[PDB]
């Protein structure tokens with residue numbers, strides 16, 4: 010209702026919003042007033058997004074590794090809603106393996122999807138933001154980017170790369186009222202995590218909080234950084250991990 | 257709404273007569289907390305009571321005085337019950353290059369900016385642990401992470417705050433208490449009140465000083481139910497002056 | 501002469517050793533007893549390396565973006581010298597631009613050369629190291645990876661990615677006596693830096709030491725991490741930047 | 748050889764009677780430094796004189812006593828000239844969960860592990876600055892960066908050490924003095940002397956405790972001419988226990 014953390018008038022683009030964290034981000038940004046565009050890799054996924062967003066946004070099909078798709082989706086957004094004010098780079102995948110078993114494809118698929126996508130999507134929205142002297146870019150990273158993790162050298166390289174990209178863009182655009190930050194979740198209750206008894210208990214053994222995080226808790230950190238009130242935060246990595254790692 | 261709603265929470269914000277501390281106390285009150293803010297003099301305490309009105313009150317407190325801390329906490333507990341949110345904002349500077357830095361300038365900083373947080377955190381923790389819910393939020397400084405010439409004492413204390421924070425976060429996370437630090441960059445306050453500002457501003461990509469309200473916002477965020485999965489963190493609010 | 505920081509018996513592979521930092525690394529490792537293989541992108545570069553290394557190693561032509569070249573060079577090394585004990589991933593490039601001017605090629609060339617190369621080269625030497633329960637992997641990163649820098653979002657993403665990769669591999673192989681670390685130089689006196697009066701004075705204005713670093717100073721940090729004495733260091737980033745940035 | 752050669756340097760290593768401090772003093776001597784190591788008792792000082800032989804000597808020092816520090820520094824300066832390398836190794840632990848942590852357990856840690864570094868660094872800095880060459884190397888702890896339950900006091904001090912380090916590095920870098928921290932993980936010493944070690948080891952990827960010589964090596968490296976471009980750094984030597 011109030012003027013606090015109020016995103017009325019802002020257009021938000023949330024990639025990979027069909028479920029879990031991306032869905033929670035999209036839902037919360039809309040609740041705080043934003044016109045939200047959520048993306049999925051298929052039209053039926055896009056349609057499921059439209060359905061949960063109702064009058065507060067819509068779903069669009071997007072492949073973040075395809076520049077043609079990116080250009081199509083942003084043109085469509087800008088026509089109806091105007092320039093994107095808030096970009097949330099949530100889309101991402103895992104292709105886990107110990108290094109000696111890791112395929113070239115498994116490395117390159119992670120680079121493309123989890124790191125190079127952020128370069129393309131960010132580049133695609135930045136001009137409009139610089140022109141208006143207002144913007145938010147928020148990348149959904151991971152505790153693994155900062156901590157490292159066995160069996161996820163590719164994922165960790167890509168997520169650490171997102172931080173290096175963020176800090177640099179932060180410096181490039183700070184004087185023009187655009188912030189660029191990363192939110193780094195620890196282990197969050199999701200389809201991915203819903204693992205056998207042993208594995209969950211093992212990861213949980215490394216969380217002081219003694220539980221998995223909720224997608225809503227990641228959404229909240231993203232909504233915070235997206236807000237007018239977070240204008241003096243840039244180049245930051247906001248860790249939301251239950252104490253799994255502390256920097 | 258239910259979002260970032262602190263209704264039912266009792267907040268203690270030290271050093272709340274002006275600047276960052278006042279912005280924190282005001283915002284926590286606006287989000288529904290019952291707020292007790294402190295100053296070092298009774299007329300300061302009164303001015304806090306005055307701006308809080310029915311949302312809380314002002315008390316006189318010296319954070320380097322065990323008997324003051326104990327008296328203020330008994331007062332708060334008697335009237336409002338135990339503290340749910342602790343904001344350690346009170347802090348000073350005693351700037352000097354090391355070769356000119358007096359024993360008392362080192363020690364005043366250790367006592368006021370670091371030991372105070374040990375004493376106050378200890379004083380509120382048992383209640384938060386029994387309740388299985390709590391927030392301790394320390395107001396650090398970019399200087400704690402970046403260092404700054406002429407502020408080795410201040411940097412030592414503010415870095416120490418983070419080591420303390422990480423340790424306590426580990427100690428109490430399983431009992432639903434979070435411990436975090438908000439690290440302001442250069443914010444327009446009395447502490448920062450032409451060539452010296454231009455020099456500071458030259459190191460801030462944002463090209464401006466931060467507002468006290470912007471620090472308040474970070475503190476309110478971490479104080480919220482929604483920030484329950486954040487602990488042992490240092491949240492930098494510095495316009496890009498430093499990036500970790 | 502002594503048993504201190506003694507690399508006698510170790511085989512070192514230093515990529516991009518024809519000049520500057522890579523050359524200084526190669527020269528120092530040889531001085532400390534290592535059999536050193538330095539690489540360049542051409543046979544004449546390789547030959548210049550052979551010439552400075554003399555009886556303590558040789559030059560080889562290597563393209564770190566070509567798996568065929570990598571497999572050829574390691575097979576050649578292993579035949580003559582045995583398994584690589586020390587890998588120094590120094591080869592790298594810059595393709596600077598502000599994001600809005602940055603080409604797809606400029607991004608992908610940096611990813612390939614500065615990040616994906618480390619995946620390939622590391623994967624190529626790790627088995628032998630794990631088998632012997634002894635190894636060093638040392639990546640030459642950059643202060644930019646941790647600090648960010650305007651006009652170098654690609655470079656910074658790749659160099660930050662190297663840290664995420666390092667931490668993960670460090671966890672994967674620590675129990676098998678292999679360390680994996682990064683050395684992150686600040687601004688070092690090199691061909692790259694030998695910039696106009698204004699630009700050098702500008703970068704120097706951000707260095708408390710008030711000078712550029714020497715390539716030998718980077719070589720020393722690498723030699724330190726390569727040593728038996730540094731066995732309890734892994735997953736670390738060793739900053740050698742004159743106080744430009746402090747973590 | 749000329750490599751990592753400390754001939755002509757005077758090194759002061761506090762807390763050098765055993766463990767890490769002794770490994771540091773021995774290695775600095777082996778690399779050619781004239782070494783003065785300290786213990787808290789004269790028989791400790793004598794044992795240091797005994798293992799150093801002609802490479803240096805042992806002195807009694809309490810790093811929480813200004814008059815002791817001043818006496819030891821005058822002794823060193825009279826005989827050997829001013830200190831070129833300062834190694835702040837002396838440190839203690841006073842473990843307890845916060846609710847059981849006494850005032851004296853907080854303060855002994857602040858005085859012994861943090862304020863001592865202010866006093867000793869201040870005592871040697873003018874000489875290093877005039878000479879335009881110097882090394883101050885603090886022995887921190889992984890706990891300063893990682894935190895640890897039951898060690899909030901120790902973590903606060905060891906984190907504080909790093910804030911101090913970054914500030915002084917900035918202050919004196921232009922005059923050729925470096926200030927750094929080596930942060931040991933769990934090292935086999937008296938301080939760490941079955942289930943408790945297994946629990947510690949379980950968090951170390953290397954699957955072993957560090958050796959005191961491995962910390963000595965890091966200290967010798969940073970003490971060297973070759974490390975002149977390293978300042979304001981924290982060098983972690985922890986077997987992968989933590990990775991920054």
Ligand SMILES: NC(=O)c1ccc[n+]([C@@H]2O[C@H](COP(=O)([O-])OP(=O)(O)OC[C@H]3O[C@@H](n4cnc5c(N)ncnc54)[C@H](OP(=O)(O)O)[C@@H]3O)[C@@H](O)[C@H]2O)c1
Nearest residue numbers: 025026027029030049050072073099100101151194196197
């Ligand atoms: N799960 C965790 O515990 C955790 C922890 C830390 C960080 N994260 C990070 O948080 C983000 C979201 O995580 P999550 O676990 O909620 O993901 P998720 O439930 O697996 O969903 C992934 C989303 O990304 C989209 N996506 C995948 N590839 C794409 C592509 N090439 N182009 C466009 N979209 C694509 C998917 O689209 P479709 O719906 O069409 O498949 C989907 O909407 C990721 O960046 C992940 O790395 C997750």
Ligand SMILES: NC(=O)c1ccc[n+]([C@@H]2O[C@H](COP(=O)([O-])OP(=O)(O)OC[C@H]3O[C@@H](n4cnc5c(N)ncnc54)[C@H](OP(=O)(O)O)[C@@H]3O)[C@@H](O)[C@H]2O)c1
Nearest residue numbers: 271272273275276295296318319346347397442443445447
């Ligand atoms: N401003 C900045 O640029 C900046 C940057 C980074 C961090 N910070 C941190 O932010 C916090 C507040 O900063 P500020 O700039 O708002 O400071 P400020 O304007 O000087 O206000 C300091 C507050 O602390 C109180 N205080 C001082 N000593 C005390 C003591 N011994 N016991 C109890 N209360 C005491 C003061 O009370 P009285 O009103 O009675 O004096 C006052 O309310 C500090 O911890 C500071 O280190 C500030």
Ligand SMILES: NC(=O)c1ccc[n+]([C@@H]2O[C@H](COP(=O)([O-])OP(=O)(O)OC[C@H]3O[C@@H](n4cnc5c(N)ncnc54)[C@H](OP(=O)(O)O)[C@@H]3O)[C@@H](O)[C@H]2O)c1
Nearest residue numbers: 516517518520521540541563564590591592642685687688
């Ligand atoms: N210069 C600095 O101030 C500075 C600061 C921080 C970090 N660094 C990093 O330190 C490392 C070395 O820096 P530098 O400035 O000394 O480099 P440099 O003098 O420009 O030389 C680069 C070296 O890398 C090799 N190389 C380039 N592309 C290659 C490829 N595709 N395959 C194989 N080798 C290739 C070059 O081979 P050829 O000889 O055949 O061309 C050359 O030997 C780099 O990773 C750089 O990012 C430099």
Ligand SMILES: NC(=O)c1ccc[n+]([C@@H]2O[C@H](COP(=O)([O-])OP(=O)(O)OC[C@H]3O[C@@H](n4cnc5c(N)ncnc54)[C@H](OP(=O)(O)O)[C@@H]3O)[C@@H](O)[C@H]2O)c1
Nearest residue numbers: 762763764766767786787809810837838888933934936938
């Ligand atoms: N061991 C570890 O796992 C570990 C890990 C991380 C960091 N560290 C750090 O490494 C340093 C040395 O550790 P350690 O394990 O070798 O400790 P230690 O075996 O307990 O030795 C401590 C040394 O400090 C001296 N000392 C104690 N209090 C002093 C005082 N007030 N004034 C002057 N000297 C004093 C002692 O002298 P006496 O011989 O006279 O008692 C002794 O020589 C400490 O700073 C510690 O915090 C150790």
